[PDB]
């Protein structure tokens, strides 16, 4: 007693729906369905989502609302030995904001350049173009498309950089976009969930408005059904594939936000007797549904290119920034009223990353605010200093070799770090803290205990599900490379430190305050294995 609270449920839901729904719902999910043989991929997707994904999503939102405090204090009051988990989780989201915000900037950059008629990326006639330029996507690497050379040779200017060691000059139009992004995030998270809850009303809802338009505009185009085939046409042969179950497991986990401390932070502002089990199920469904819907949006346009524009589906069907910043814009340029589709598309991409970035920063702020009252009393100054650190370091990704810096963090930062973090989150709650003890916490909140189905997934399924993704991730590991460029072995090591920077906090904090308390284990051990009972 006591803590600040939400402005009412729709704010919380939109914040969670906002954080959960990002570009991964767009440039990733639809691709996996295509690669994994269509609606058949939904089987391993739905299964991995039900047993592994939701229970983890449910779990964080539960004890997030129950303990009513940030990730650091929450795990400190839960399993003081594992408090380091809260530290790891927070600084993981700290690393992500160094890069992930760049995607929003790129979206704003394309938004500014899309004001004009005759969109710049529709022609090889321009000044930044190579003789190897093509009108649209192809096979051979040496020859790129028009929309591809615009992104690389104009916006990113990645051609100037020979690698990560050379970042080249700082691009200020790009630095301007990054600053604009950090400004929006500041006047959002400025006063906290008071303003934050209201802003997500736009950022969360807007993407669905544009999705509906592009969904209609896409299906109104020739060959749109051909794209839907490449999208949802079932191959159940992939069901027996190991990589398919891995991709479904991986996507389901990363699509939802568990382990980032974001859900934990957002839920901590909930009313104690609020029903999380309803919110968790609702939010989860809306997330996957959005990906499914967006899938039709992409492949409707993708199939359109294969039909009218005469390009192989294998070439135009892709994932990540390449899809949204290159492939899709290329199709929009061909359509009538090009400028309109381009403007709303790029605005959607920005609003898709914004509410996702809000939760990320909030996870840091809330976790720290509860831990340290000094930055709890001073808010506006803290977030100003935080985003200042982001912008300065973020200038590294605004350079000419910025993508090389971006791609380094993308792979290493949160990739292998959070899997082990959430694995300890699952083990701590289900075993150290115990399931029967956790189930009782939920009963006191929502009125009823979790079904034994949820108990089993937390204690057994989740841990195996996590190691399953982690084990195969390590076995299928390869040195970091982008395009024809291979990262130096020192660059790889620099990313493992970042990946280890978080994870190491868990055993570190476990050892640190293990030597702080008196007595002898088990006595010292049992003190840290006991929750906060007063």
């Amino acid at each position: 007693d006591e803590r600040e609270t939400w402005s009412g449920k729709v704010d919380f839901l939109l914040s969670v729906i906002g954080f959960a729904v990002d570009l991964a719902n767009v440039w990733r999910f639809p691709y996996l369905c295509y690669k994994n043989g269509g609606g058949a991929f939904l089987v391993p997707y739905g299964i991995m989502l039900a047993v592994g994904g939701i229970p983890l999503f449910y779990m964080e939102l539960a004890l997030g609302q129950h303990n009513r405090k940030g990730a650091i204090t929450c795990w400190g009051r839960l399993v003081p030995l594992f408090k380091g988990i809260g530290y790891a989780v927070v600084l993981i989201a700290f690393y992500v904001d160094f890069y992930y915000n760049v995607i929003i900037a790129w979206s704003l950059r394309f938004f500014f350049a899309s004001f004009t008629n005759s969109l710049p990326w529709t022609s090889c006639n321009n000044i930044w173009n190579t003789p190897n330029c093509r009108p649209f996507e192809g096979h051979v690497e040496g020859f790129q498309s028009a929309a591809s050379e615009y992104f690389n040779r104009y916006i990113l200017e990645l051609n100037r950089s020979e690698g990560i060691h050379d970042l080249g000059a700082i691009k200020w139009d790009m630095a301007l976009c990054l600053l604009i992004v950090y400004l929006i995030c500041y006047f959002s998270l400025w006063k906290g969930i008071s303003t934050s809850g209201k802003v997500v009303w736009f950022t969360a809802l807007f993407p669905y408005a544009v999705l509906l338009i592009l969904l209609i505009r896409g299906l109104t185009l020739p060959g749109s059904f051909l794209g839907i085939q490449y999208y949802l046409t079932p191959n159940f042969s992939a069901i027996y594939k190991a990589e398919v179950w891995v991709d479904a497991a991986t996507q389901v986990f990363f699509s939802l936000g568990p382990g980032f401390g974001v859900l934990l932070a957002y839920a901590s502002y909930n009313k104690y007797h609020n029903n999380v089990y309803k919110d968790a199920l609702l939010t989860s469904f809306i997330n996957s549904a959005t990906s499914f819907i967006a899938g039709f949006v992409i492949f409707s346009v993708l199939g359109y290119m294969a039909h009218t524009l005469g390009v192989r589906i294998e070439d135009v069907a892709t994932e990540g920034p390449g899809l949204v910043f290159v492939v899709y814009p290329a199709a929009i340029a061909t359509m009538p009223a090009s400028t309109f589709w381009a403007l709303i598309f790029f605005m959607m991409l920005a609003t898709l990353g914004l509410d996702s970035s809000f939760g990320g920063s909030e996870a840091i702020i809330t976790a720290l605010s509860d831990e340290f009252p000094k930055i709890k009393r001073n808010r506006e100054l803290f977030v100003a200093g935080l985003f200042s650190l982001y912008f300065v370091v973020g200038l590294a990704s605004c350079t000419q070799g910025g993508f090389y810096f971006f791609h380094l963090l993308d792979r290493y930062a949160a990739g292998y770090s959070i899997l082990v973090a959430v694995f300890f989150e699952a083990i701590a709650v289900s075993w150290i803290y115990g399931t029967n003890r956790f189930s009782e916490d939920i009963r006191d909140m929502i009125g009823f205990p979790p079904g034994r189905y949820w108990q089993v997934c937390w204690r057994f399924v989740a841990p195996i599900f996590l190691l399953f993704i982690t084990v195969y991730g390590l076995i299928g590991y390869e040195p970091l490379t982008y395009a024809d460029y291979v990262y130096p072995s020192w660059a790889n090591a620099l990313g493992w430190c970042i990946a280890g920077s978080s994870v190491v906090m868990i055993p570190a904090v476990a050892i640190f305050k293990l030597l702080s308390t008196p007595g002898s284990l088990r006595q010292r051990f049992t003190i840290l294995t006991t929750p906060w009972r007063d």
Partner: antibody
Amino acid sequence: EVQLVESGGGLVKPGGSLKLSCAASGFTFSSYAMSWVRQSPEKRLEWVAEISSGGRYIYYSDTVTGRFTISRDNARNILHLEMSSLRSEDTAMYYCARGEVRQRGFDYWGQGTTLTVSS
Amino acid sequence: ENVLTQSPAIMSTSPGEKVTMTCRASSSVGSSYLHWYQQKSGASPKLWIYSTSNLASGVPARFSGSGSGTSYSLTISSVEAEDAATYYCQQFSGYPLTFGSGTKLEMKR
């Protein structure tokens, strides 16, 4: 199947103290939460106190608050109600019930045990 | 405290007829948090209707729950002699938990 048996209780002088016990069987005791509900000689049902499945979260009525203590033994599956400074208004038949799911109300009730506070 | 009031206090009915007893709360109660209990003479109370609608195991279909907010009702389509007892409505919505005044159902002859 499920059976609850209230034991103890009887004549007690005003200001005195007594302990009631409920023997639970037929179900896992640690899983379900328990509550004490008393019915006065005027047949008015009044909820007394509720204990969690692990005996952590506790709730009392404003009537018996501070004068009553509800305990739990999950080893022997025994529910306990510790009374002190009993008044005449506390005279009723005390029931043992579960008590777990708020939306399902009280699953099963004991046969009840009678407590009479008089001089 | 949330005061649940039930009426009528005592009710006489001939077997086969339709009886309706209401429940009224000081504060609004969740429709899933309102339950009904049937206590026969010299016997312990028994869970009858929970969540305002759903019956319990062993409860005949002749019983039906209804209502919401501050007003609820229990209805017996065709009353039988074995249905004569005192019925208590109760809310789990918030602490302290409270039982209705109860409606005593007696058979008319």
